[PDB]
Amino acid sequence: AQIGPVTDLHITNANISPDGFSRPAVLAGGTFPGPTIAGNTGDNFQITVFNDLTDPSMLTDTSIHWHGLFQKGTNWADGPAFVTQCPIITGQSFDYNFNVPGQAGTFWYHSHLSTQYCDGLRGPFVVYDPNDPNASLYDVDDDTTIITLADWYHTLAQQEPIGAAITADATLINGLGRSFTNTTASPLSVITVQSGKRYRMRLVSISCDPNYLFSIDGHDMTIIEVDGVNSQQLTVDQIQIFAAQRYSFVLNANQPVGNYWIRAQPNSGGQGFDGGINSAILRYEGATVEDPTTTAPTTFSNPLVETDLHPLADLGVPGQPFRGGADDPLVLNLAFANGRFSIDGVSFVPPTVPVLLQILSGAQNAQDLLPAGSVISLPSNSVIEVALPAGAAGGPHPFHLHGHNFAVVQSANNATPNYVNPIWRDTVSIGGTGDNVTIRFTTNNPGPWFLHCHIDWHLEAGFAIVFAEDIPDTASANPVPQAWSDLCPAYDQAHNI
């Protein structure tokens, strides 16, 4: 069952074996992935998060972010540790009480403390639209049509050795999959469809790192939503999905009754499908209970290319139709050296006092804010452009902005910008060497919004800045509850800070 929009959510430690290998984890709702949190557009979510964690090897503090939800007037509920709150300590709870006006689509939630979401605190978050303009394109849209793609590690996140390469040990589709080494024939996920029906498949990358080449043998996929933004229909036979992105696609159960492989090939870790790694099963009702015998093509006919996507609505692009054609045009210098990432020469290290609390306490320019050089002010009611030229090691980097979606004026692997009808989204691959992926948005949401690579290992290694949007109006726009004001004193006391 789905939970919410008003629910408790307990965060616990438990052993799990999603690929046949047992390890401890950090779980929401007792499962990996966590339960789907759901409601309708405009609803009031009240998610009372109970931190019941006791195993320090995965951190006993926590904080949860609701990825892609704008949090307008509720910046304090956004979740990034040391940006909008101090963490919740063990044995305490915290009510994330917010609204989702003007949004409907496929989102997710995850820990936003250190690399803790990699240890298991990740799940889907769906905001349905009772008047969805895409409703007539499908028959079924429910918990059974959510498809999560996850990387899974045998080594605990906090225990990844300094100086060794980090790669995953399994791809999990709907929480199940097989290990790349010492593969055992552990259970695969089954997605069941009925011949003749049409399904809104909600594809969610809950990855800490790899991008996936996602496909379904024998089928094609008609994209209708990108990171919460309705799209024109775009039929593809493969989707390269980067960490934290979402798509909805229509799956027409229009092939013979049978079993078909679902494929999710990560860019690192195990290559191929030997022993059923990187795989799940699409099973038609009435098919034999057996593995598919289908193959992929050698070359896909219609892979997703981001510039092919266009909004369903007339969203346009704010500003003027040329580089720098914005009120506040930025170009970030994104770099990596010696184990640390930097943005404009500064590697992100979380501050002691959350950025929001510093602002509420009267710090009122970005040069006043800690960490020094990591907080950039944005003016209110302005068109912002951010160019994100690639080249830093470890790419392709999926950059994500909290508090906002954005027009993708320039996409990976294509030097031509689009000032007319590009897709809007919230997480974008910045591509490869020489690319100049560029985003635009307007500043109508006062508060400090994190901008970072969503490869969690890279965030931990500093690949982030905070946009302090409309510092002057942050306090008036974001009244804070007493429980939020209590977080830092409790955290600092527990940690002898």
Ligand X SMILES: *[C@@H]1O[C@H](CO)[C@@H](O[C@@H]2O[C@H](CO)[C@@H](O)[C@H](O)[C@H]2NC(C)=O)[C@H](O)[C@H]1NC(C)=O
490: three-class secondary structure by DSSP: helix
**For residues 236 and 356, which CB has a smaller minimum distance to Cu ion in the complex?**
356
Please tell me whether 458 is known to bind a ligand: yes
> Which residue minimizes CB distance to ligand X?
324
Q: Which of 113, 346, 455, 465 binds Cu ion (CB under 5 A)?
A: 455
Minimum Å distance from CB 312 to Cl ion?
Answer: 21
Task: Kindly report the number of other CB atoms within 10 A of residue 301's CB atom.
Answer: 9
Please tell me whether 495 is known to bind a ligand: no
Whether 402 is catalytic is: yes
Contact present, 199 and 251 (Cβ < 8 Å): yes
Residue type, 396: P
Minimum Å distance from CB 238 to Cu ion?
Answer: 22
Does the protein bind Cl ion through residue 402 (CB under 5 A)? yes
Residue type, 96: Y
- Cα–Cα dist 387/322, whole Å: 12
Minimum Å distance from CB 213 to ligand X?
Answer: 18
Q: Which of 450, 467, 484, 491 binds Cu ion (CB under 5 A)?
A: 450
Backbone torsions φ then ψ of 366, nearest 5 degrees: -70, -30
The footprint of Cu ion on residues 46-85 (CB under 5 A) is 67, 80
Whether 400 is catalytic is: yes
**What sign has the CA pseudo-torsion 336, 432, 459, 375?**
positive
Does the protein bind ligand X through residue 315 (CB under 6 A)? no
Exactly one of 86, 219, 384, 400 is catalytic; which is it? 400
Whether 404 is catalytic is: no
Fill in the per-residue mask, 384 to 403: x = in contact with Cu ion (CB under 5 A), - = not in contact. Answer: -------------x----x-
- Longest Cα–Cα distance in the chain: 66
Please tell me whether 453 is known to bind a ligand: yes
Give how far Cα 31 sits from Cα of 27, 119, 159, 305, Å: 6, 12, 22, 34
**For residues 310 and 402, which CB has a smaller minimum distance to Cl ion in the complex?**
402
What are the residues whose beta carbons fall under 8 Å from the beta carbon of 155, sequence distance 6 or more?
A: none
Instruction: Give the binding-site size for ligand X (rule: CB under 6 A).
Output: 13
Does the protein bind ligand X through residue 324 (CB under 6 A)? yes
Q: Which of 346, 351, 317, 333 is nearest to 439 (CA)?
A: 317
Does the protein bind Cu ion through residue 244 (CB under 5 A)? yes
Whether 65 is catalytic is: yes
Give how far Cα 149 sits from Cα of 18, 75, 196, 202, 213, Å: 13, 28, 26, 11, 10
Minimum Å distance from CB 320 to ligand X?
Answer: 11
Minimum Å distance from CB 68 to ligand X?
Answer: 23
Please tell me whether 452 is known to bind a ligand: yes
Instruction: Give the binding-site size for Cl ion (rule: CB under 5 A).
Output: 2
Q: Burial level of 43, CB count in 10 A (0-12/13-18/19+)?
A: middle
Give how far Cα 152 sits from Cα of 114, 399, 431, Å: 16, 21, 24
Please tell me whether 400 is known to bind a ligand: yes
Does the protein bind Cl ion through residue 458 (CB under 5 A)? no
Q: Sheet holding 239-241: strands in order across?
A: 190-193, 279-284, 259-266, 212-216, 239-241
Q: Which secondary-structure segment (H or E) carries 65?
A: strand 64-67
The footprint of Cl ion on residues 63-82 (CB under 5 A) is 68
Q: Which of 154, 143, 152 is nearest to 106 (CA)?
A: 143
Please tell me whether 454 is known to bind a ligand: yes
Give how far Cα 428 sits from Cα of 44, 155, 388, Å: 28, 28, 10
Q: Which of 205, 231, 436, 443 binds ligand X (CB under 6 A)?
A: 436
Does the protein bind Cu ion through residue 404 (CB under 5 A)? no
Whether 67 is catalytic is: yes
Does the protein bind ligand X through residue 323 (CB under 6 A)? yes
Whether 208 is catalytic is: no
Whether 154 is catalytic is: no
Exactly one of 11, 397, 406, 450 is catalytic; which is it? 397
Residue ranges binding Cl ion (CB under 5 A): 68, 402
Residue ranges binding ligand X (CB under 6 A): 305, 307, 323-324, 329, 331, 387, 389, 414, 416, 418, 436, 438
Residue ranges binding Cu ion (CB under 5 A): 67, 80, 244, 397, 402, 450, 453, 455, 458
Q: Which residues are catalytic?
A: 65, 67, 110, 112, 397, 400, 402, 452-455, 458, 463
